[PDB]
């Protein structure tokens, strides 16, 4: 059955961009997916999106501008102390200068730079670069 909606969303988006598409539909939607797309947008990797209601689990329409080298999730959501972040940075990311590991903390969803800017830990949910 369906377990990880975010994993399927990110696979669909990577496929659509690798083809060279302008838009892609991902279903279902969820609060976590909207948070992940909001972070991707604020870093500049995707354009506008739109969540369309259907009195069910909704759909999302995503606009693409060809800046996404890769995006994925980490399952299960291992927890990370503040000092192990860097031992993860040199594991998933192509460098120490660009790319983003996304954590959920008691201060919200955020990338790793802000996580060591607030010197806290959390649980890893995914990455894009």
């Amino acid at each position: 059955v369906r377990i990880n909606v975010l994993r399927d969303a990110l696979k669909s988006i990577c496929n659509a961009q690798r083809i060279g598409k302008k838009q892609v539909i991902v279903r279902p939607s969820s609060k976590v997916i909207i948070e992940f797309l909001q972070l991707m947008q604020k870093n500049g990797y995707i354009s506008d999106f739109a969540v369309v209601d259907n009195h069910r689990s909704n759909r999302i329409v995503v606009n693409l501008i060809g800046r996404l080298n890769k995006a994925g999730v980490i399952s299960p959501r291992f927890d990370i102390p503040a000092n192990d972040i860097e031992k993860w940075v040199v594991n998933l990311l192509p460098s120490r200068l660009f790319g983003h590991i996304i954590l959920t903390t008691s201060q919200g969803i955020m990338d790793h730079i802000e996580a060591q800017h607030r010197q806290i830990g959390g649980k890893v949910i995914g990455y894009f670069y």
């Binding site: 909207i34 797309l37 506008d48 999106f49 739109a50 969540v51 369309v52 209601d53």
Partner: protein, 162 residues
């Protein structure tokens, strides 16, 4: 004094005087700006009574200086499961923000049923879809619905047609 529940908080007296349906009464009329200024609250277990004749009622009010909406008075509850001592009491699901804000947008245009909603992420905004046949009789009322919805929920809103 028999047309409203509150008393003695008195901005528009004349609404109660003119509304004098013999069994019905209202509470807490309001004024919202933005042109032709604008919302009339009713006790909740009479909305079905008020909405019965509401298309031909709002005409016999629009007090030409203002425009009138009829909305129900609804309570939003803060916590789910208040733990009072030894037990937890469950918040009714109709009392959440997500339910009340969806009811307000439906009561804002009651004779007409919206046929779709989308949330755009450009500050996010809400796009509301209406049937095209009734483009007239709403065209001149749309800015009022948008402004009033932002006044009662603080959500940006735009309107498009089937």
């Amino acid at each position: 004094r028999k047309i409203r529940k509150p008393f003695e908080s008195e901005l528009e007296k004349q609404v109660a005087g003119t509304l004098l349906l013999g069994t019905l009464y209202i509470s807490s009329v309001k004024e919202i700006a933005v042109d032709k200024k604008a919302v009339v609250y009713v006790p909740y277990p009479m909305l079905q009574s008020f909405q019965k004749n509401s298309e031909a009622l709002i005409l016999k009010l629009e007090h030409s200086g203002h425009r009138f909406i009829i909305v129900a008075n609804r309570t939003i509850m803060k916590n789910a499961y208040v733990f009072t001592g030894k037990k937890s009491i469950r918040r009714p699901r109709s009392r959440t923000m997500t339910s009340v804000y969806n009811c307000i947008l439906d009561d804002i245009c009651y004779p007409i049923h919206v046929i779709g909603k989308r949330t755009l992420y450009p500050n996010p905004r809400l796009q509301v879809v209406l049937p095209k046949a009734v483009y007239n009789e709403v065209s001149e009322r749309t800015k009022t619905y948008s402004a009033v919805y932002k006044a009662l929920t603080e959500r940006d809103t735009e309107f498009i047609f089937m």
